[PDB]
Design a protein around this ligand. Structure first.
Ligand SMILES: [Ca+2]
Ligand SMILES: [Ca+2]
Ligand SMILES: [Ca+2]
Ligand SMILES: [Ca+2]
Ligand SMILES: [Zn+2]
Length: 316
């Protein structure tokens, strides 16, 4: 829409109040013109036709409970855009300031969210397994990192490349959650998963086995379900990334942590310069070693930590 940029206020899914960038032209729309070619949030109105209607609002105050998922999707896409711009000097997901589009209220009782190749889509959850999925900043950043991958390495979504694809999204979703300093942790989806239970989450990067996911290459899933285990075998890579960052001893192998910032620089470089559509775990290890080598020298501690971490999860 063509209009005047302004700022509205509303409440997100967890009840927190925030300012959001809107556009005024008869109605106030969820269109943020301050970032690249714009961030646009749509109402799918409980249907599965996409994108639905650009979200329109009469007075620029988004406190209705129907508005909550739209507020957070809108807001957390802006935070993710800022993270990639400020930290990695990347303008939007294609590197050219492509418009970011999200639809909320997709379908009825839908317990998921996803990047479909052209935009983000968020279900509201059934209210028991999940509440509206855009309330989780690590979920929004996970899904938006899928767009980044698609334009760079292009990892195919099955078997080991798909598991790498998923782990990359859990890693940057987590790094965006630490960047926004929203109660950060190494768990995925804990703000929106099972509103009745405290403490749990969909997956854990610091201890994947807590939920039954593999934390070592000898425990990888080899069947056919979940596209060859793309959400399951990503635990091996997540555990490796957690160790590079934080350090620790795993199956008897000791890793000195080098921190989150270097973790993000190494994986972002590996992703945009060395991974290809069919890379598998052993090529990820080589990409990450080469990236850390490029940035810190082949005899740095950084290179040494990336090798110990992949040795600790059994990836050679
Ligand atoms: Ca309103
Ligand atoms: Ca958290
Ligand atoms: Ca989290
Ligand atoms: Ca829970
Ligand atoms: Zn994913």
């Amino acid at each position: 829409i063509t209009g005047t940029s302004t700022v509205g206020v509303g409440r997100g899914v967890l009840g927190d109040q925030k300012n959001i960038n809107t556009t005024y032209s008869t109605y106030y729309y969820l269109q943020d013109n301050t970032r690249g070619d714009g961030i646009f949030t749509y109402d799918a109105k409980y249907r599965t036709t996409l994108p639905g209607s650009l979200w329109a609002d009469a007075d620029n105050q988004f406190f209705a409970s129907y508005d909550a998922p739209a507020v957070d999707a809108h807001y957390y896409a802006g935070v993710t855009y800022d993270y990639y711009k400020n930290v990695h000097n990347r303008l939007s997901y294609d590197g050219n300031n492509a418009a970011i589009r999200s639809s909320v209220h997709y379908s009825q009782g839908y317990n998921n969210a996803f990047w479909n190749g052209s935009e983000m889509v968020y279900g509201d959850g059934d209210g028991q397994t999940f509440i509206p999925l855009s309330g989780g900043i690590d979920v929004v950043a996970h899904e938006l990192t899928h767009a980044v991958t698609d334009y760079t390495a292009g990892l195919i979504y099955q078997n080991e490349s798909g598991a790498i694809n998923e782990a990359i999204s859990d890693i940057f979703g987590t790094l965006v959650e630490f960047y926004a300093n929203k109660n950060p942790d190494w768990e995925i989806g804990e703000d929106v998963y099972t509103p009745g239970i405290s403490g749990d989450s969909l997956r854990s990067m610091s201890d994947p086995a807590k939920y039954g996911d593999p934390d070592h290459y000898s425990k990888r899933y080899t069947g056919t379900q979940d596209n060859g285990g793309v959400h399951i075998n990503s635990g091996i890579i997540n555990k490796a990334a957690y160790l590079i960052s934080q350090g620790g001893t795993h199956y008897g192998v000791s890793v000195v942590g080098i921190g989150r910032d270097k973790l993000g620089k190494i994986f972002y470089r590996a992703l945009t310069q060395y991974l290809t559509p069919t890379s598998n775990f052993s090529q990820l290890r080589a990409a990450a070693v080469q990236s850390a080598t490029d940035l810190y020298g082949s005899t740095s501690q950084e290179v040494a930590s990336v090798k110990q971490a992949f040795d600790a999860v059994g990836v050679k």
